Design a protein around this ligand. Structure first.
Ligand SMILES: CCC1=C(C)/C(=C/C2=NC(=C\c3[nH]c(/C=C4\NC(=O)[C@H](C)[C@H]4CC)c(C)c3CCC(=O)O)/C(CCC(=O)O)=C2C)NC1=O
Ligand SMILES: CCC1=C(C)/C(=C/C2=NC(=C\c3[nH]c(/C=C4\NC(=O)[C@H](C)[C@H]4CC)c(C)c3CCC(=O)O)/C(CCC(=O)O)=C2C)NC1=O
Ligand SMILES: CCC1=C(C)/C(=C/C2=NC(=C\c3[nH]c(/C=C4\NC(=O)[C@H](C)[C@H]4CC)c(C)c3CCC(=O)O)/C(CCC(=O)O)=C2C)NC1=O
Ligand SMILES: CCC1=C(C)/C(=C/C2=NC(=C\c3[nH]c(/C=C4\NC(=O)[C@H](C)[C@H]4CC)c(C)c3CCC(=O)O)/C(CCC(=O)O)=C2C)NC1=O
Ligand SMILES: CCC1=C(C)/C(=C/C2=NC(=C\c3[nH]c(/C=C4\NC(=O)[C@H](C)[C@H]4CC)c(C)c3CCC(=O)O)/C(CCC(=O)O)=C2C)NC1=O
Ligand SMILES: CCC1=C(C)/C(=C/C2=NC(=C\c3[nH]c(/C=C4\NC(=O)[C@H](C)[C@H]4CC)c(C)c3CCC(=O)O)/C(CCC(=O)O)=C2C)NC1=O
Ligand SMILES: CCC1=C(C)/C(=C/C2=NC(=C\c3[nH]c(/C=C4\NC(=O)[C@H](C)[C@H]4CC)c(C)c3CCC(=O)O)/C(CCC(=O)O)=C2C)NC1=O
Lengths: 160, 52, 174, 161, 74, 91, 380, 161, 160, 161, 160
């Protein structure tokens, strides 16, 4: 969170929260309702984003669902869409947190080691999250999908 | 042989004592009535109730 | 097992102080909410096993894999154990609704619980789901019977014990 | 550590369920009280020095403690004492502004009782000094925010005792 | 132990140990020495000139060394 | 360890019943009680023969009689078998 | 927070025949006689018959289920999940039949079907599962008619199933603590009767000398954690004889063993008054310290009045005489018997070992008091 | 605990399958070896005392251990030593006759290493004593049953080491 | 007996007899006439076992029949062979019982205290019973003398 | 640490004796098995990744552990999990190739039970993962070498339990 | 436990030797100091109450400990405090009168630091109370016996 990041920041400096940091918190707690609208919309439209993002993923990338790929079969494709549902959930957590600390600690810290231990190409995961970013930007406003879309951009930057 | 332990119907030893105190057994019988009155008067009723 | 009264009094024992205006205010709030709290205990006292079977059926429809051969609640025996535990959670949470303090929950339920379910290979996630499936039921029944006798509708005191056990038994990823 | 948002987030994550309306009410409550927490933290940041000076003047000065033989007697010990009060004040502000006393569990109350019983720091005097900061701080931030800071100072006092 | 001898303190917290443990596996022990000695704390406290020395001592070691409350005047 | 030093109500120890027996005293009662549990129906435990008869140490006899009477037992025949009586010294 | 460790625990499942065969002589510290060997002879000779039974049921399971499935039965009730539940149940009875025949005789079935009739009754009829099980028993018996011995075994298992489906929920096993401080816990009676029942040794004095010797040898194993006789040749002959007469009840035998110098030489001399308290609970009651206020209770007795008055005060307790009374040797209370409080999980399993003789610090007082306090100073 | 039968019902049960031909082959194997396990347990039951006597005579006597200063030096320690060899022989018989060493995991090797490292019991000498019981026992029961007893004595030796 | 031991066993467990234990009783009551053959043979051949076993005892162990020994003289030797006759009788009881409970309670519980109170070396008693085991195994079949010989083995293990 | 050679020199050294025929027979045993230990370590060195992947796939995945609330749930925790399986496989190879599990006593099993009981790592699931590595590894190296790896994985399983 | 005599028989026993003149000199040392140890134990037995009263009055009263918030603040804690001072004085007398502090190793100092660091008992205040008992006790028994009690009080203090 933003509050956690500022407390950590001036904790490591062993000083009180600085005026600049305090101003940001005010801007955060006043921007609350807008964020809750965004996470509300991505909450109630999750099945379209996971389904449609998975369709654009598998249509762009016919590798992994081909015989010989990682996600070949009904069960494996279901597990693939299950993970896209995970990163969608984490993005909604990152929107209401006002920071990518939930996204990072639940999903990104040592992701490369996990998918390398699964035999999964992580570039396919990043293409999937980009597809969900395009669907979620199709479901929102201009500035709104700029904000949410940038949380998705952070997860893309962590996968690549 | 197979006899019930302690020579009784159920094999239990150290059964409850069916006897009563000296004052009680001397009081139950029709004779020793004058002794029960004398031990009543002197108060040696009391020392005969003891369990020594 | 200190209720709200004994918690306040122990606090003023650590101070050495007497009771001030703040103490008497917090006590007056407790003695005000107590009548409402009693009504809740009468509700759970009426409908206990109905709550328990409902939170059961909800729990097992949401996680069907407990009844799968890999799962935990898979057998008659393991099932009856699970229902037994849900009866515990409802009982002690009712006590914490009486006392108004979550110290009974810590002293008699929660301490050594993570260790016990870790020792028996009982899963944590199903357990936390069970506790909030209790919380929603008691919440709904209190909203209906709240609006009958008119009432103050507010329900944070009812949510508090179950929220406490959920926060305790949870695992921290942040 | 965790704030109220993370506590809310943590509960959602373990269950694994998406956010639902009851969780939001908690977030609405925090975001309603947010501005109050901000201005309180601003004022305590402004007047930390005066809080510690007035609280040490009420609780500790001209007593057996700063007279020789007491634990505050040398300058070294005076400076370590005031610094401890400052530490309590700062982390009490972090705990107020997070809305969750987990910080006091992690970074303050851990092994402090073993440390003060090791060094010779009187527990009683410390608690009294913290209560003095509770009264001075509540006098600065007012009634509402004084209640909020009062639950974190009372948390530290309950930790030491 | 190597943390205590190279830096003078025990580890602040669990997060700190994890970094060292993690470096251990990916890169090895030589890199473990390199991350402690090229850390910012060592460079600031000791630099190129000062032999390391014991800076922080936990409470068990001070009850142990008969300091503060524990000591015999006698 | 004679059970009569520093009697309770205000003493640190929780109140308990304390017997007159001397330290390491050789005194016993030949007794007959008939105690029914009252509590096997919710516990579902095995039947243990009631109406037992035993030699109870004199020092701890007081605790036993109070405990039998607390759980609705009925006592039939208290005899002092083992010891001597009204002896000021030597138990 | 604080905790004890979390040691691995086999929950309890069921018993097989060679299982409980070995485990009885294991529990009495024996070393198998000709008779118990003749159990494993009998059961281990007749195993290939059970293999042929599990063969033919495993081959004919579909045919077994369908012939129940027609006469049990609906589009208009009973959704797809519900129909799958009933089908899963019919396959499922046959699964525990092949398991109950290959393994030892009738423990999986009996504890896994006894209560459930009312778990199902909120959904389906009581007449339904009866006629489904009776069609499966009749098709099974008429399938196994050739090789008459095998269908005699098989008949016994099915008849036990439809006996056990008839009865009841098995009630509820509750645990009320006389003391106010302790907390009550209930256990389903279904959970308790899985495993091997732990024998209780009762000396009525009308027994025969085997039965007196086994009870007395059980007392030494309870109080001392090992057989003192047969190793160090320690004999207590008049405590033994005054118990063989019923002159001493078995409670007073545990008392006079607890006040002997071998008890104090074994358990009091090498240990702290806190640790002496803990071990006196393990030996004299067969459970750990329930809670902190009980420890502060009995520690005042030990600490002010020595060991003899502690052991006196434990055996004079009103919770000794409902668990044990005066006619049973004390026994441990682990997972199989009673409801295990969560508060003392790991530490209790720390106790009930031989190895927890050796633990020199105190277990429980550190654990309870550490539950009251905050994070301690140690490493992470 | 568990025997081989229980273990087969554990695997077949925990997969949710029935008993297939592989599990029936395992039960056929155990039921073929059943009578050999029985007569082996009968012979060890007959000659336990001589197994312990000859194994102590081979492995432990006339050395530093029974000389003063060694761990077997007194009569209490000698009797505890041969008592422990009696447990190893008895539970090795139970492990043989169950066909599954889970009893040795539950009731013997639990806490035993902590016990012997607590008391000062030498591990190496214990291992050599158990192997002496393995050679003497294999000499009594013969080749096949000596192989069976050999896997359980080696199980205990692998547990201590 | 086996019946006594099973009934006592499920009595202390306070349950009915298990199917397993009832199979054990079936195998016992079907093995009856073989057992009665064994104890019939050791009954009608007792004088050879006692005489020949006593000769092998005194020939192996010339201690006790030497002057100053426990068994010196005619009366003492007669008492020695009388005791070997006792242990042969008890072994026959143990064979028909199907359990060594008769052997243990009639003969073995407190035997060391008795012969130590008589001044008799109990190792010589065990050597005597081993000699009678060799004679009784010479009078029987293979499996038969395995069974009976193992009851003798139990008595040897109780003496030593 | 110590290998089999060093252990022989330890026993013969600590008796003060020289190397007799028994110790030379032990060194002959190790030098006979040496090449088998080499090629086994070669094959495990080749296929470590696939051992960990197949063993996690058998033992841990698609259960409560990787579902939310389980120990393995966070990615961070998955990577720590497979990291620890890598240490068990690597030090099990070292224990195999030394012929003496002293390495596992010094650098792995010391303090590991206190660590996992500190963190909240379930012991049971760890043991099942190690046994999965035992089955997969035995499948790669074959029968004899799979018995050798079996005694070292069973050594670690005996250490945690 | 063990006294000085038992310790002599332990060293001579564990060497396998008999008792040589060094060990007899140690037994002569103990038997010379015997009566002094006896009368010292008699006096401490007479005045234990006053030792604990004067030592609590010197070391513990009128400080933060008996003020509220301190560890002696209630009556339950006061009584537990003086109870523990009674144990230290009693076991110090046992250690004096045995001439060997093994008793303090077995029955006091084992796990006591883990107990007091568990409960929250200050170790420093405890040590100062024990030393107050040392000064008062040395004042009662005199110089020589005060040196003997001084080594055992110092032994307990070394433990904490
Ligand atoms: C909340 C953070 C978090 C994540 C993300 C997570 C992922 C995760 N992915 C898994 C498997 C998997 N994940 C994938 C994913 C993919 N396959 C492809 O080709 C595509 C590139 C991609 C989908 C977009 C596949 C195929 C498997 C199973 C592979 C196998 O089992 O062989 C497993 C194995 C067991 C299980 O799922 O229950 C975990 C734990 N766990 C976590 O705790
Ligand atoms: C072998 C060991 C074993 C058995 C036998 C077993 C039975 C069992 N049956 C159950 C439910 C059920 N059982 C039935 C059965 C029936 N409905 C009908 O109308 C029919 C007449 C009848 C079957 C013939 C139904 C409908 C339910 C589901 C009730 C519900 O949860 O909605 C449940 C609750 C779990 C679930 O299925 O959701 C158990 C645990 N469990 C075991 O571990
Ligand atoms: C008053 C505080 C308190 C609690 C809560 C408590 C719980 C407790 N739960 C137990 C078992 C259990 N508890 C469960 C519970 C569940 N299974 C699932 O899948 C679900 C998520 C969940 C039910 C909602 C199961 C299956 C067992 C038995 C597991 C086994 O034995 O294999 C046991 C083992 C022995 C016994 O029950 O008697 C205890 C002591 N004890 C206490 O003192
Ligand atoms: C042994 C080392 C040591 C020192 C030096 C020490 C000083 C010390 N000076 C104090 C106050 C003070 N000290 C001064 C000193 C001065 N005012 C001026 O204008 C002058 C420059 C200067 C005198 C030369 C004054 C005015 C106060 C009290 C101020 C107040 O209370 O408002 C106090 C406050 C309470 C008390 O005195 O009991 C301490 C503890 N304490 C120590 O342990
Ligand atoms: C089956 C379950 C089980 C086992 C196995 C067991 C072992 C065990 N061995 C013990 C002691 C001992 N164990 C030994 C063993 C040995 N000394 C040697 O030199 C040999 C090399 C070695 C045996 C091979 C000795 C000498 C002691 C006595 C230590 C002492 O108390 O003086 C003790 C302490 C109690 C006592 O005997 O006084 C236990 C509890 N306990 C159990 O409950
Ligand atoms: C070779 C020497 C060595 C070993 C073996 C070792 C183990 C070890 N495992 C750890 C944590 C852990 N270990 C696991 C392990 C598991 N989780 C599961 O569900 C599985 C069942 C199981 C593995 C099979 C997990 C999840 C954690 C992380 C706990 C946390 O910090 O969040 C930690 C804490 C540091 C960290 O990883 O963050 C250590 C130090 N450390 C060592 O120095
Ligand atoms: C034979 C070896 C042995 C010792 C020493 C021992 C001590 C012991 N001290 C205790 C408490 C205590 N002990 C103290 C002691 C003190 N408070 C202070 O400030 C002073 C420094 C100090 C007195 C000199 C206090 C205050 C408590 C109770 C604290 C509490 O309950 O909050 C308790 C808690 C329960 C009970 O007493 O029954 C034990 C078991 N137990 C043993 O078996």
């Amino acid at each position: 969170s933003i509050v956690t990041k500022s407390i950590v920041n001036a904790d490591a400096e062993a000083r009180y929260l600085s005026p600049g940091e305090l101003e940001r918190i005010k801007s955060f707690v006043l921007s609350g309702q807008r964020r809750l609208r965004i996470a509300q919309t991505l909450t109630e439209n999750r099945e379209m984003i996971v389904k449609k993002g998975g369709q654009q993923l598998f249509q762009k990338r016919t590798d992994v669902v081909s015989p010989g790929g990682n996600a070949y079969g009904e069960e494996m494709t279901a597990t693939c869409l299950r993970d896209l549902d995970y990163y969608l959930r984490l993005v909604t957590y990152g929107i209401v947190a006002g920071d990518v600390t939930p996204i990072e600690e639940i999903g990104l810290v040592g992701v490369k080691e996990m998918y390398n231990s699964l035999g999964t190409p992580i570039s396919g995961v990043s293409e999937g999250v980009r597809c969900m970013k395009d669907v979620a930007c199709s479901l929102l406003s201009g500035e709104d999908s700029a904000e949410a879309g940038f949380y998705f951009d952070y997860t893309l930057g962590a996968m690549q | 042989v197979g006899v019930p332990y302690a020579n009784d119907k159920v094999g239990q030893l150290y059964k409850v004592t069916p006897t009563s105190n000296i004052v009680d057994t001397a009081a139950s019988v029709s004779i020793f009535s004058t002794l029960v009155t004398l031990l009543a008067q002197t108060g040696l009723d009391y020392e005969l109730k003891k369990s020594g | 097992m200190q209720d709200t009264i004994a918690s306040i009094v122990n606090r003023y024992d650590c101070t050495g102080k007497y009771l001030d205006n703040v103490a008497i205010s917090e006590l007056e709030s407790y003695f005000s909410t107590a009548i409402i709290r009693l009504k809740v205990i009468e509700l759970i006292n009426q409908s206990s096993s109905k709550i328990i079977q409902e939170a059961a059926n909800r729990l097992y429809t949401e996680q069907p894999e407990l009844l799968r051969p890999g799962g935990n609640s898979y057998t008659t025996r393991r099932y009856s154990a699970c229902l037994r535990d849900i009866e515990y959670y409802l009982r002690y949470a009712s006590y914490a609704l009486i006392a108004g303090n979550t110290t009974i929950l810590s002293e008699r339920v929660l301490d050594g619980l993570k260790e016990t379910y870790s020792s028996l290979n009982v899963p944590i996630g199903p357990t936390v789901r069970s506790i909030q499936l209790l919380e929603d039921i008691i919440c709904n029944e209190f909203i209906i019977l709240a609006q009958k006798q008119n009432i103050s509708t507010n329900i944070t005191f009812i949510q508090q014990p179950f929220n406490y056990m959920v926060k305790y038994l949870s695992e921290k990823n942040i | 550590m965790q704030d109220a948002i993370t506590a809310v987030i943590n509960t959602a994550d373990v269950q694994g369920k998406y956010l639902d309306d009851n969780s939001l009410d908690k977030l609405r409550g925090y975001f309603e009280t947010g501005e109050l927490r901000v201005r309180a933290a601003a004022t305590i940041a402004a007047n930390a020095a005066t809080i510690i000076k007035e609280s040490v003047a009420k609780a500790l000065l001209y007593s057996d403690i700063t007279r020789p033989g007491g634990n505050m007697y040398t300058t070294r010990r005076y400076a370590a004492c005031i610094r401890d009060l400052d530490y309590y004040l700062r982390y009490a502000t972090y705990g107020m502004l997070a809305g969750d006393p987990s910080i006091l569990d992690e970074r303050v109350l851990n092994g402090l009782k073993e440390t003060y019983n090791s060094l010779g720091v009187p527990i009683g005097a410390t608690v009294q000094a913290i209560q003095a900061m509770k009264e001075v701080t509540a006098s600065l931030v007012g009634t509402n925010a004084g209640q909020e800071m009062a639950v974190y100072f009372d948390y530290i006092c309950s930790g030491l005792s | 132990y190597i943390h205590v001898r190279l830096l003078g303190r025990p580890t602040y917290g669990r997060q700190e140990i994890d970094q060292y443990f993690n470096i251990v596996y990916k890169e090895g022990y030589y890199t473990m020495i390199d991350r402690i000695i090229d850390s910012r704390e060592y460079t600031e406290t000791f630099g190129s000139s000062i032999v390391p020395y014991e800076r922080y001592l936990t409470s068990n070691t001070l009850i142990s060394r008969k300091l503060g409350s524990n000591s015999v005047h006698n | 360890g004679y059970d009569m030093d520093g009697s309770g109500s205000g003493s640190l120890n929780p109140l308990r019943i304390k017997s007159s027996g001397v330290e390491k005293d050789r005194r016993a009662f030949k007794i007959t009680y008939c105690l029914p549990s009252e509590s096997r129906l919710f516990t579902y435990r095995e039947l243990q023969n009631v109406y037992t008869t035993k030699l109870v140490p004199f020092s701890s006899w007081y605790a036993e009689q109070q405990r039998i009477q607390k759980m609705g037992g009925k006592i039939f025949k208290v005899e002092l078998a083992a010891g001597g009586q009204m002896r000021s010294c030597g138990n | 927070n604080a905790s004890a460790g979390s040691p691995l625990v086999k929950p309890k499942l069921y018993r097989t025949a060679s299982m409980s065969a070995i485990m009885q002589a294991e529990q009495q510290d024996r070393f198998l006689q000709l008779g118990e060997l003749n159990e494993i002879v009998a059961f281990l000779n007749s195993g290939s018959k059970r293999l042929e039974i599990a063969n033919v049921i495993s081959n004919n399971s579909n045919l077994m289920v369908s012939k129940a499935a027609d006469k049990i039965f609906n589009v208009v009730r009973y959704g797809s999940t519900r129909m799958q539940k009933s089908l899963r149940d019919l396959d499922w009875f046959l699964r525990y039949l092949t398991y109950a025949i290959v393994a030892g005789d009738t423990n999986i079935l009996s504890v896994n079907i006894r209560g459930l009739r009312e778990l199902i009754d909120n959904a389906c009829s009581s007449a339904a599962a009866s006629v489904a099980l009776r069609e499966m028993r009749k098709v099974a018996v008429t399938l196994f008619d050739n090789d008459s011995a095998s269908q005699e075994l098989v008949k016994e298992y099915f008849n036990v199933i439809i006996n056990e489906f008839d009865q009841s929920r098995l009630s509820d096993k509750l645990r009320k603590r006389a003391s106010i401080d302790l907390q009550g816990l209930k256990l389903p009676q279904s959970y308790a009767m899985a495993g091997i029942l732990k024998p209780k040794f009762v000396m009525k004095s009308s027994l025969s000398a085997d039965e007196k010797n086994t009870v007395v040898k059980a007392c030494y194993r309870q109080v001392f954690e090992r057989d003192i006789a047969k190793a160090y040749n320690i004999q207590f002959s008049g405590l033994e004889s005054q118990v063989k007469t019923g002159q001493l009840s078995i409670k007073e035998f545990v008392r006079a063993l607890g006040k002997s110098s071998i008890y104090r030489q074994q358990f009091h001399e090498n240990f702290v008054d806190s640790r002496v308290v803990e071990l006196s609970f393990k030996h004299f009651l067969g459970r750990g310290i329930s809670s902190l206020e009980e420890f502060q209770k009995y520690f005042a007795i030990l600490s002010s009045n020595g060991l003899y008055s502690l052991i006196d005060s434990l055996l004079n307790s009103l919770e000794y005489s409902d668990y044990f009374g005066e006619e049973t040797v004390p026994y441990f209370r682990d997972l199989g018997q009673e409801a295990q409080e969560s508060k003392n999980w790991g530490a209790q399993i720390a106790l009930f070992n031989y190895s927890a003789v050796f633990r020199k610090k105190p277990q429980f007082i550190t654990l309870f008091s550490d539950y009251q306090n905050n994070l301690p100073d140690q490493h992470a």
